[PDB]
Write a protein that binds this ligand. Sequence first.
Ligand code: HEM
Length: 179
Amino acid sequence: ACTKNAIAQTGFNKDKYFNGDVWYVTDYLDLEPRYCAALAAGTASGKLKEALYHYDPKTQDTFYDVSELQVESLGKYTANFKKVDKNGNVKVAVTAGNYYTFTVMYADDSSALIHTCLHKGNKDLGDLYAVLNRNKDAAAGDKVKSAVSAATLEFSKFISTKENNCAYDNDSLKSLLTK
Ligand code: HEM
């Protein structure tokens, strides 16, 4: 179960974050504990959208999702996901109870700290924090690391994805934003 009400960045710039480009997860902190993950965030016909990519570099399990984000407040969203193939073909339709919340705690032009809480069927899932970068496997800079500290989190507890043999289809993620 999730336990955190993450606070969104003061002065969060939604147009800059939801600009259609890709964000790579470089480090993550699962509160209820080795996938690679990335997302594109953008707008399509005035709707906030995210496309997600998960890849397990050991098992090869790979899945994509597309979501419309509903606004709770600035920087805090609720997203109903549909599982799709890389082309946007629907594999699992949207259903109530399958959603995640998404809070942007810090963002700038190259980096971000987010919180997400996943709800899926009758599964019991926990909070996840992620450090994001515009560049694949980029080392976390001082701004986002300071934001981790300011959120009262210990960055040394995060797990890096940078040393995983991961590959990302950024072209598919960007194209999925319209799906
Ligand atoms: C490296 C960081 C992450 C790891 C290790 C990770 C891990 C996982 C795992 C293991 C599952 C399978 C859950 C299950 O069905 O048992 C999953 C599903 C999911 N995750 Fe993540 N995740 C990460 C980042 C994210 C982020 C940042 C988001 C949202 C922005 C997200 C959203 C989702 C969604 C929506 C599903 C369900 C997709 C579906 O069933 O169609 N994940 N993740």
